[PDB]
Ligand binder design. Structure first.
Ligand SMILES: CCN1C(=O)c2cccc3c(S(=O)(=O)NCC4CCN(C(C)=O)CC4)ccc1c23
Length: 129
């Protein structure tokens, strides 16, 4: 009588068909950018996939078609899922914009996302060659 929602499987984090191509920029994204964002005071709501049921967001996956979270990004970096830094940056962008899409501009969670995004853009300015 009250819809409670339901969760998808989490996004894929490995691509076994792809060669292991390590780069300085991807190393930096894992060891500096991701780690720095992870430890920020506002990071915790973004560290794992949204649980629409336990968070009482029963329409979350109706609205958000491409979910993304920092735990998924961390695994993708660890597993060498990304071909380049741009792909990883795109996933951070998807994570922040999903928050802006689902929520209202004045919401606390949006202030948190904006702060993380500003820090992320600062850290991406410091990427290696
Ligand atoms: C980032 C994924 N995400 C959402 O988009 C979202 C919307 C509404 C609540 C919520 C939550 S939540 O844990 O239910 N509420 C987040 C609040 C919890 C209270 N706050 C703090 C700093 O202690 C502000 C952030 C987690 C992750 C979410 C959301």
């Amino acid at each position: 009588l009250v819809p409670r929602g339901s969760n998808p499987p989490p996004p894929e984090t490995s691509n076994p068909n792809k060669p292991k191509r390590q780069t300085n920029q991807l190393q930096y994204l894992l060891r500096v950018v991701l780690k720095t964002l992870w430890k920020h005071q506002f990071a915790w709501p973004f560290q794992q996939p949204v649980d629409a049921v336990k968070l009482n967001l029963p329409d979350y996956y109706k609205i958000i078609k491409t979910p993304m979270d920092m735990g998924t990004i961390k695994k993708r970096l660890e597993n060498n899922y990304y071909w380049n830094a741009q792909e990883c940056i795109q996933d951070f962008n998807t994570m922040f914009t999903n928050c802006y899409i689902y929520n209202k501009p004045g919401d606390d969670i949006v202030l948190m996302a904006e702060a993380l995004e500003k820090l992320f853009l600062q850290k991406i300015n410091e990427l290696p060659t």
